[PDB]
Swiss-Prot record:
Homodimer. Interacts with MAG. Interacts with RTN4. Interacts with NGFR. Interacts with LINGO1. Interacts with KIAA0319L. Interacts with OLFM1; this inhibits interaction with LINGO1 and NGFR. Interacts with OMG. Belongs to the Nogo receptor family. Its main location: membrane. It comes from Mus musculus (Mouse). This is Reticulon-4 receptor. The chain holds residues 26 to 336 of 473 of the full protein. It is a lipid-anchor; GPI-anchor. It is found in: Cell membrane; Membrane raft; Cell projection, Dendrite; Cell projection, Axon. Keywords: Cell membrane, Cell projection, Disulfide bond, Glycoprotein, GPI-anchor, Heparin-binding, Leucine-rich repeat, Lipoprotein, Membrane, Receptor, Repeat, Signal. One of its GO terms (molecular function) is ganglioside GT1b binding. Residues 236-286 form the LRRCT domain. Disruption phenotype: Mice are born at the expected Mendelian rate, are viable and fertile. They display subtle changes in exploratory behavior, manifest deficits in spatial working memory performance, and show impaired ability to stay on a rotarod. Compared to wild-type littermates, cultured hippocampus neurons from mutant mice display an increased number of excitatory synapses. Effects on neurite outgrowth are controversial and may depend on the mouse strain, cell type, and the experimental conditions. Cultured neurons display impaired axon growth cone collapse in response to myelin, MAG and RTN4.
Length: 290
């Protein structure tokens, strides 16, 4: 078992093939089949062809971040049934992941897809990832959150979606995420949230929605959040008239930690906080009650 190229090969704590920041233009040939950790980060790999690591049956960790990934083959990860961590982040020119790329990775615990320029989450992309706990999708180019996108992710605790261009939250965007603990949707273009979009998020404790385009929010959308303890809503154009009364009422009973809910309109209440207003301030109009 010769160590490929200028890689560093060692056995403890796990059999590791480390070849970082060597300017590699492709996955090196001859990676030992006993590899449990493969570090190919910081190079210049542009493609990941099919069965690139099929001999590493015991592969549990694979890092490909900070490369030049422009295309990943659909069968790139064939035979990696024991893969627990996959890192593809900091490849801002990836743009699109084939929807079959992650199939069969039933032991995957964490998946780093942040800063990959992702344009869309095609159907079936996260199918079958029943073990996944951490999913990093922030700092991409996402323009929609299709329904059932995380339907099989019953063990997901952390979903990072901030830093995209998501325009709204449909009803089934977060179906199945029963174990979800942290959900980060800030720094997007979220303008509306379906009243039942957070139906399965009864175990959620942190919800970040600041820096969006929310002008109102029906109190129904927060009602399923029985476990919530941190809520961010600042940097949104809140309308503080009759339409904000339900959100106002829910916030009066919230025992957790919440950010400012700054009023954008009317100018009389400019940058006042909704939770600190009186009910008499929320009368008249400036749909719904109007
Ligand atoms: C994976 O590990 C098992 C037991 O640790 C070993 O028998 C097997 O040969 C390994 N697979 C390789 C080296 O491809
Ligand atoms: C999901 O989590 C539960 C409890 O943490 C665990 O028993 C189960 O095996 C996990 N799912 C998978 C596919 O490992
Ligand atoms: C917010 O939504 C309004 C429509 O209600 C639209 O005119 C405006 O351009 C949006 N702003 C951003 C930053 O998305
Ligand atoms: Cl590690």
């Amino acid at each position: 078992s010769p160590c490929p190229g200028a890689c560093v090969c060692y056995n403890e704590p796990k059999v590791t093939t480390s070849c970082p920041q060597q300017g590699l233009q492709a996955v090196p040939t001859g990676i030992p089949a006993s590899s449990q950790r493969i570090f190919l980060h910081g190079n210049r790999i542009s493609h990941v062809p099919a069965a690139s690591f099929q001999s590493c049956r015991n592969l549990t960790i694979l890092w490909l971040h900070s490369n030049a990934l422009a295309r990943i083959d659909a069968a790139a990860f064939t035979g990696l049934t024991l893969l627990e961590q996959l890192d593809l982040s900091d490849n801002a020119q990836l743009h699109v992941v084939d929807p079959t790329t992650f199939h069969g990775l039933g032991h995957l615990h964490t998946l780093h897809l942040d800063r990959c320029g992702l344009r869309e989450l095609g159907p079936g992309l996260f199918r079958g990832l029943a073990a996944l706990q951490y999913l990093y999708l922030q700092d991409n180019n996402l323009q929609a959150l299709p329904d059932n996108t995380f339907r099989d992710l019953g063990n997901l605790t952390h979903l990072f979606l901030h830093g995209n261009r998501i325009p709204s939250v449909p009803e089934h965007a977060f179906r199945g995420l029963h174990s979800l603990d942290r959900l980060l949707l800030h720094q997007n273009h979220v303008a509306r949230v379906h009243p039942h979009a957070f139906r399965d998020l009864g175990r959620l404790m942190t919800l970040y929605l600041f820096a969006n385009n929310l002008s109102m929010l029906p109190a129904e959308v927060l009602m399923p959040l029985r476990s919530l303890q941190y809520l961010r809503l600042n940097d949104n154009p809140w309308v503080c008239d009759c339409r904000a009364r339900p959100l106002w009422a829910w916030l009066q009973k919230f025992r957790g930690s919440s950010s400012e809910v700054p009023c954008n309109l009317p100018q009389r209440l400019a940058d006042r906080d909704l939770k600190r207003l009186a009910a008499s301030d929320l009368e008249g109009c400036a749909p719904k009650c109007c």
